[PDB]
């Protein structure tokens, strides 16, 4: 990863905060192409002090998929280590994450449009399992919307795919726990069976997100019944809009080796 000076970098408002992480907005001051001065819109991704000793992890993956690029991947700039600091600085991505937007527009969002993104974001994971790089945490809040829909000029959504953050190799129990059902039985049972396979399962899951308006599957469900919700071999309630449903069973099962290849699941998203 480039290394960028914290002086070049202002941090202005919060985004909110993920596991271990706060995230801000903010600005690089960078010079770019022909040697002309840029204030760049930035996503800053900051681990929190008091959990330094995951610092390897919170850039890891993130590192091994930048050194892929692909047109579905979201662009890493680099990272600030200076002083206390542990910064991913990203590109900044319009319209945020899906699962917020697809809760602001539940009533304006039909199954082409959710269709387009799975055939998106298949692409994307078509692309890493050709490259045999796993992921680890595909979910609708790390797909970013890059541009909407415009009907008037035909004009799909695009999204891509962010970085995992901390592996769950390496995350505590409790929190893999209330992560049921993105991260599979397998990783449940053992952290340690975190591969390729995985990230079948959690794409299933987050074409329930898409297909459910940001709802978040078995969020009434406390980390105990999420426990038992996978000893009881379980599976997520069909979506009202179920165009998918069998998709995403299909992807969640519970035999990791069944789980089918992205052209596979690229195949059958291009015959709806």
Known sequence: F???????????????????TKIFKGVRREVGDYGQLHETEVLLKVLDKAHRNYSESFFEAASMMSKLSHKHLVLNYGVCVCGDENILVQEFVKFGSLDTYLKKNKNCINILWKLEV???????????????????????????????????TG?????????PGISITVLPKDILQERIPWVPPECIENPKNLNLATDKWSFGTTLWEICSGGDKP??????????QFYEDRHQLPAPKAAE???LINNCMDYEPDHRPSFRAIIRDLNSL
Do not use: W, Y
């Open 118 to 152: 799975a055939k998106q974001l298949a692409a994307a994971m078509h692309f890493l399992e050709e490259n045999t790089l796993i992921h680890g945490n595909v979910c609708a809040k790390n797909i970013l919307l890059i541009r909407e829909e415009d009907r008037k």
């Open 244 to 246: 998918l449903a069998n």
């Open 2 to 20: 480039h290394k960028i000076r914290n002086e070049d970098l202002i941090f202005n408002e919060s985004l909110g905060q993920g596991t271990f």
């Open 218 to 227: 078995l969020s009434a469900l406390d980390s105990q019944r999420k426990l």
């Open 155 to 163: 004009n799909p959504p695009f999204i891509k795919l962010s970085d």
